[PDB]
Design a protein around this ligand. Structure first.
Ligand SMILES: *[C@@H]1O[C@H](CO)[C@@H](O[C@@H]2O[C@H](CO)[C@@H](O[C@@H]3O[C@H](CO[C@H]4O[C@H](CO)[C@@H](O)[C@H](O)[C@@H]4O)[C@@H](O)[C@H](O[C@H]4O[C@H](CO)[C@@H](O)[C@H](O)[C@@H]4O)[C@@H]3O)[C@H](O)[C@H]2NC(C)=O)[C@H](O)[C@H]1NC(C)=O
Ligand SMILES: [Ca+2]
Lengths: 131, 226, 239, 216
C-alpha cells in the first residue's frame, strides 16, 4: 500500500494492476521476481495479493526475455526451462497468448493448475561462476 | 595566432653548408627582434644569434662567430640562419623564436631586445659523414598467453634522426610509449613504440603504427596482431 | 582484508577497484556489464559526482591499474534512505559510461533471490584491497577471506553491537576477531555459494576497528535492497 | 659576461610548492632581467616568467618569479604543483651582447612506488629473414626510475649485447617506462630455446621473469 519514493500510500488492489498510481512507479515496476536458488519465476497478483509461480504453459524465450526487461536486465537473457515447483505454492499464473502488448505480469491470469505441469525457471544473466 | 614555423633542417657533411628559414605569421614581423636558439640531443638550450627589427644589428654566440649568418626578409615575413663550415657539434634542434621582450633606450636611440615570448617548432640539423638509411619496421606482437596486453613496432637501423610514430593515424594516444632512440654500435638508430590495450580488444580493434622517416621518404603503416 | 590470502586471477571476477584522483578509494561488485554495487558512504559529498570515479575490473594489482584505462562512471545513485550518521541503508549503485567485456577475469555476481534459505551461520567470502590490519594502508594486491554470517540477534547483544544492527544490516566474521574486512574494502562483496551459484549477500559497510574481538564486520543487507536496485536498473533502461 | 647555475634536479609532491634557483656567477642578478622557459620532453619551450616576475598571458598564477640580492639568484616558484608541470626549466638573462641560459633543472613529481608491468617480445619472423634477431623486453608504468633488466638465454646471464631506453616521467600518472633490446644473429638465436627477461624493482617483492621458448 505504501509507495517508497514518497510517503504515499495506495490501495492493495492498485499494486501491480498495469496502471501507475505511485508517483515513483513503485506499484508497477517490481511485479516480476525470481524466487529461490532455482530461479522460479513469480508474478504478483493484484487479486490474491500474493506472489505465484508462472506456468510453463505456452511459455518461450520471447516471454522470458520480456520478464527480464521488466526486471531491469534490458537485453540480457541466459537460460530458461520448465521445472516442478519447489516453492510450496498452491496456485499459479497462466499465460494469455492473446493478451496484446502489455507488461508481462498483465498477460497472466490465475489458474489452480498448469496444463504442462511445470513452472518457469528463468535466469536473465550468466552470473555467479568463477574460475 | 602568433606562429613561427622553421624549415631547412637536414643531414649535412662536416664542412658543409645549410640555410634554415623561419616563417612568421599572426603579427607584424618587422615590429620584433628575432633569434635562433639550439639544443643538442639531451643537452640544454644554447643561444645562437639574434637580429634587430630591421636587420641593422646582429649578435652571435662565440661558438658560431665567423661561420653563421643571421638575416631577415621583412617583406617575406621570414627569418634566416645561413650556416657555413658546419661541424659535428652543431648537431642540434634549431628553434626560431621571437625576442619580443624589449625596451626603448632614449640615450642610445634604439631598442634593446633581451627575452623570448614565442617559440617555434624546431628543425633538426645533423652534421655527419654517415649516409641516410631508411628503417625496417617489425611488429612487437602480443603474447597470445590478463586484462592488459602490450603490442608495438620496432623501428630499426635508420639514419639520421628522427622518426615519428603514431598509432591509428592519431586516434590512439592513451597508453602509447614511444621510446627515445638508441644509437647502435653499427652507427644506426633504433627505437620501439608500444601501446598497452585491453586484452579483450585484441580480436576486435585494429592497431596500426604509422612510422615516418622523412630523411629517406620512408612511410610505413604496419598492422600489429597476435 | 584482515587474516586472508592473496586472490588468484578469476577467483573473484565481480570485484572492482573504484578510484578517485588515480588512487583506490572503495570496492564494488559487478552485477551487469554496466552496473556496480558499492556502499553509499563511499559516494558522500563531494564524491557523489560520477565524473570523479573510475572502475578497474579483472586486475589484481593496484600498480597495474593505469590512469586512463579504467572505466569512467556515468551515474552514481545512493540509496534514498541512506543515513550517514548511523550508516543505515549503506548501499549505492554506479553505472559505467561504457559496458564491461566479460571474460575469465571479469564476470558478474548474482543478485540474491527471495527464499535463499541461507543457514544462520552461512559460510561466506569477502574480498578487497583494504588494509590487512587495522589502520594499515591500502593493499597492493587483492585479498580474500572466509567469514561466517552472525545472526542479527546475536550481533545486537550488549557485548557486540548493542542494538545497532538494523534489518538493512547483516553481520559477518568472527566474534573472536582475527578475520575481517577493513578500511579500503568498503563497498566490496560479501558472497556465498548455494546451488553452485555465487550470490551477493552484502556490501562492506562499517565496523569498530578491524578484526577486533566482539566487533565483527557489518554489511549492507543486499537482499533488502534488491527491489531498489532493480528499479534503478529498469529506470535507466528507459533511456 | 657571466654564467647562470641551476640545480640539476628538483622534486616535490603534487599540490605542494616548489622553488627552482638560478645563481649568476658575476655581476648582480638585478642588473639584467631574468626569464624562465618550461620545456616538456620532446616539445618546444614555452615562456612562463619574464622580467623577473611577470607572467605571459595564459600562464596560471601558480607560476611566480623573484630575485634575491644576497644569494645573487633568481627563483621560479610553482605552487599547487601538478603532474603536467614535470618538465625541464631554464632561466635566461643577458649581458651587453650575449643571451645566457642556465643549465636547466628537471622537475620530478614525487609519487608512490609502482611495480612495472613486464612484457617480452620474440623477434618477428620478418626480421629473422634479414639475419638478425631483436628480443624486446618492456617495463611499463613503474616508479621510481631505477630498474634492472637481466637477460638470460637458456639460463645463461647475458652481458654486452643489450641496450636500454627509458621514457621521461609520464605527464598524467608520473611513471616511467623502459625498453630493453637484446640483439643476436639469427644463427645464434636458433642455437638456444629459453629467452628470459628478469626484472628487479623496488615495487617487486622478488624478481619478475618473463620468458618464451623459441618456436613454441
Ligand atoms: C486474454 O486477453 C484478451 C485480450 O484482452 C481478452 O479478451 C478480452 O476480454 C475482455 C473481458 O472479457 C472483453 O471485454 C468485454 O468485451 C465485450 C465485447 O465488446 C467488446 O469488444 C468490442 C469489439 O468490437 C468493442 O466494440 C466493445 O467496446 C467491447 O470492448 C463487452 O460486451 C464487455 O463489456 C460488457 O461486459 C463488462 C463485464 O464483462 C461490463 O463491465 C461492461 O459494462 C459491458 O456490459 C467487455 O468489454 C474484450 O472484448 C476481449 N477482447 C478481445 C480482443 O477479445 C481475454 O478475455 C483474455 N483471456 C483470458 C482467459 O484471460
Ligand atoms: Ca497500479
Amino acid at each position: 500500500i505504501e509507495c517508497d519514493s514518497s510517503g504515499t500510500c495506495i490501495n492493495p488492489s492498485n499494486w501491480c494492476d498495469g496502471v501507475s498510481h505511485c508517483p515513483g512507479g513503485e506499484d508497477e515496476n517490481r511485479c516480476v521476481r525470481l524466487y529461490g536458488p532455482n530461479f522460479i519465476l513469480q508474478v504478483y497478483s493484484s487479486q490474491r495479493k500474493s506472489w505465484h509461480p508462472v506456468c510453463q504453459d505456452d511459455w518461450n524465450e520471447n516471454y522470458g526475455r520480456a520478464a527480464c526487461r521488466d526486471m531491469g536486465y534490458k537485453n540480457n537473457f541466459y537460460s530458461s526451462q520448465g521445472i516442478v515447483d519447489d516453492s510450496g505454492s498452491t496456485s499459479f499464473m497462466k499465460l494469455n497468448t492473446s493478451a496484446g502488448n502489455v507488461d508481462i505480469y498483465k498477460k497472466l491470469y490465475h489458474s489452480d493448475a498448469c496444463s504442462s505441469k511445470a513452472v518457469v525457471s528463468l535466469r536473465c544473466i550468466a552470473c555467479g561462476v568463477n574460475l | 595566432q602568433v606562429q613561427l614555423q622553421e624549415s631547412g633542417g637536414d643531414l649535412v657533411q662536416p664542412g658543409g653548408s645549410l640555410r634554415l628559414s623561419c616563417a612568421a605569421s599572426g603579427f607584424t614581423f618587422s615590429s620584433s627582434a628575432m633569434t635562433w636558439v639550439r639544443q643538442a640531443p639531451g643537452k640544454g638550450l644554447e643561444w645562437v644569434s639574434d637580429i634587430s627589427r630591421n636587420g641593422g644589428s646582429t649578435n652571435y654566440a662565440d661558438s658560431v662567430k665567423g661561420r653563421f649568418t643571421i638575416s631577415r626578409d621583412n617583406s617575406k615575413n621570414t627569418l634566416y640562419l645561413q650556416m657555413n663550415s658546419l661541424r659535428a657539434e652543431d648537431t642540434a634542434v634549431y628553434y626560431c623564436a621571437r625576442e619580443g621582450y624589449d625596451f626603448w633606450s632614449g640615450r642610445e636611440r634604439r631598442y634593446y631586445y633581451y627575452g623570448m615570448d614565442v617559440w617555434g617548432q624546431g628543425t633538426l640539423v645533423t652534421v655527419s659523414s654517415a649516409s641516410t638509411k631508411g628503417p625496417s619496421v617489425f611488429p612487437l606482437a602480443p603474447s597470445s598467453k590478463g586484462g592488459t596486453a602490450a603490442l608495438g613496432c620496432l623501428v630499426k637501423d635508420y639514419f639520421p634522426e628522427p622518426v615519428t610514430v603514431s598509432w591509428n593515424s592519431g586516434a590512439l594516444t592513451s597508453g602509447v610509449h614511444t621510446f627515445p632512440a638508441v644509437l647502435q654500435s653499427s652507427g644506426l638508430y633504433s627505437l620501439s613504440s608500444v601501446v598497452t590495450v585491453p586484452s579483450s580488444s585484441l580480436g576486435t580493434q585494429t592497431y596500426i603504427c604509422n612510422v615516418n622517416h622523412k630523411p629517406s621518404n620512408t612511410k610505413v603503416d604496419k598492422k600489429v596482431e597476435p | 582484508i584482515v587474516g586472508g590470502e592473496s586472490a588468484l586471477p578469476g577467483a573473484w571476477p565481480w570485484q572492482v577497484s573504484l578510484h578517485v584522483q588515480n588512487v583506490h578509494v572503495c570496492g564494488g561488485s559487478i552485477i551487469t556489464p554496466e552496473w556496480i554495487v558499492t556502499a553509499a558512504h563511499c559516494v558522500e559529498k563531494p564524491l557523489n559526482n560520477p565524473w570523479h570515479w573510475t572502475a578497474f575490473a579483472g586486475i589484481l594489482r593496484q600498480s597495474f591499474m593505469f590512469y586512463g584505462a579504467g572505466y569512467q562512471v556515468e551515474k552514481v545513485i545512493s540509496h534514498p534512505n541512506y543515513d550517514s550518521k548511523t550508516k543505515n541503508n549503506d548501499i549505492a549503485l554506479m553505472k559505467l559510461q561504457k559496458p564491461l567485456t566479460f571474460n575469465d577475469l571479469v564476470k558478474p555476481v548474482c543478485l540474491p533471490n527471495p527464499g535463499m534459505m541461507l543457514q544462520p551461520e552461512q559460510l561466506c567470502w569477502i574480498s578487497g584491497w583494504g588494509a590487512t590490519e587495522e589502520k594499515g594502508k591500502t593493499s597492493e594486491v587483492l585479498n580474500a577471506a572466509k567469514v561466517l554470517l552472525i545472526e542479527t540477534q546475536r550481533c545486537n547483544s550488549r557485548y557486540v553491537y548493542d542494538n545497532l544492527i538494523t534489518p538493512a544490516m547483516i553481520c559477518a566474521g568472527f566474534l573472536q576477531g582475527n578475520v575481517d574486512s577493513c578500511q579500503g574494502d568498503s563497498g566490496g562483496p560479501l558472497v556465498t555459494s548455494k546451488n553452485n551459484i555465487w550470490w551477493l549477500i552484502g556490501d562492506t559497510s562499517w565496523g569498530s576497528g578491524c578484526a577486533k574481538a566482539y566487533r565483527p564486520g557489518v554489511y549492507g543487507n543486499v537482499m533488502v535492497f534488491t527491489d531498489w536496485i532493480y528499479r534503478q536498473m529498469r529506470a535507466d533502461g528507459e533511456f | 659576461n657571466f654564467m647562470l647555475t641551476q640545480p640539476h634536479s628538483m622534486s616535490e609532491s603534487p599540490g605542494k610548492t616548489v622553488t627552482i634557483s638560478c645563481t649568476r656567477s658575476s655581476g648582480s642578478i638585478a642588473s639584467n632581467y631574468v626569464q624562465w622557459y618550461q620545456q616538456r620532453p620532446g616539445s618546444s619551450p614555452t615562456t612562463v616568467i619574464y622580467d623577473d616576475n611577470q607572467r605571459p598571458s595564459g600562464v596560471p598564477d601558480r607560476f611566480s618569479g623573484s630575485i634575491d640580492s644576497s644569494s645573487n639568484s633568481a627563483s621560479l616558484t610553482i605552487s599547487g604543483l601538478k603532474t603536467e608541470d614535470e618538465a625541464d626549466y631554464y632561466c635566461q638573462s643577458y649581458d651587453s651582447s650575449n643571451v645566457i641560459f642556465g643549465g636547466g633543472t628537471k622537475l620530478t613529481v614525487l609519487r608512490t612506488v609502482a611495480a612495472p608491468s613486464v612484457f617480452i617480445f620474440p623477434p618477428s619472423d620478418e626480421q629473422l629473414k634479414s639475419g638478425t634477431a631483436s628480443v624486446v623486453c618492456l617495463l611499463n608504468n613503474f616508479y621510481p626510475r631505477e630498474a634492472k633488466v637481466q637477460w638470460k638465454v637458456d639460463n645463461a646471464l647475458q652481458s654486452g649485447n643489450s641496450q636500454e631506453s627509458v621514457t621521461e616521467q609520464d605527464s598524467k600518472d608520473s611513471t616511467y617506462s623502459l625498453s630493453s633490446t637484446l640483439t643476436l644473429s639469427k644463427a645464434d638465436y636458433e642455437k638456444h630455446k629459453v629467452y628470459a627477461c628478469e626484472v628487479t624493482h623496488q615495487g617487486l617483492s622478488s624478481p619478475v621473469t618473463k620468458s618464451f621458448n623459441r618456436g613454441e
